[PDB]
Design a protein around this ligand. Structure first.
Ligand code: CL
Ligand code: CL
Ligand code: CL
Ligand code: CL
Length: 183
């Protein structure tokens, strides 16, 4: 964390900009120079703007967006911001990675947001597993019926090539559960 630049940047842009001296607009935008200065004040003496540009442009998932001198995270916020969705229709199945410990409550009342503003879904099975493992448990992957969501009046918004958001996933819209412990 304190050694991982992209992980630290995601935290600044999604959860806690103020303690790095970073101001965000209500669309999530930060000045890259202000991000670099905030990281340097926090002890990252070697960080330069070309690092932050590369964290964004070489990110494998499209976590970040640049615009002349500014940067934002496209999704994952716990800070209230508005990010406009990308064009594109979601595929019929999306994945959500979680823990086996969370399954009984998910089965009762669905997937609900944690600290983030929205529930996040991915078209990449690999990424769903990686995300579940961050919750540090036996990983469970939920296969989510996207048109079930839309039939329930939930908008499914594309925030990056592979990541989509929704307010809530009703338990009826969970098509399949795959448990790590049974692989
Ligand atoms: Cl968001
Ligand atoms: Cl708005
Ligand atoms: Cl926007
Ligand atoms: Cl999420």
């Amino acid at each position: 964390m304190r050694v991982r630049l992209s992980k630290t940047l995601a935290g600044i842009l999604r959860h806690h900009p103020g303690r790095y001296g970073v101001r965000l607009t209500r669309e999530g935008w930060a000045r890259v120079s202000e991000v670099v200065e905030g990281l340097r004040k926090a002890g990252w003496s070697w960080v330069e703007e070309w690092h932050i540009v590369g964290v964004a442009l070489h990110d494998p998932k499209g976590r970040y967006e640049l615009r002349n001198g500014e940067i934002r995270a496209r999704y994952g916020h716990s800070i209230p911001v508005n990010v406009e969705p990308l064009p594109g229709e979601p595929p019929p199945i999306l994945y959500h990675g979680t823990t086996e410990e969370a399954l009984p409550l998910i089965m009762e009342r669905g997937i609900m947001r944690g600290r983030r503003l929205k529930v996040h879904l991915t078209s990449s099975l690999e990424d769903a597993v990686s995300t579940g493992r961050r919750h540090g448990n036996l990983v469970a992957v939920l296969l989510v019926d996207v048109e079930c969501l839309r039939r329930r009046g939930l908008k499914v918004e594309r925030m990056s090539k592979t990541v989509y958001t929704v307010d809530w996933v009703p338990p009826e819209c969970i098509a399949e559960v795959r448990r790590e412990s049974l692989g």
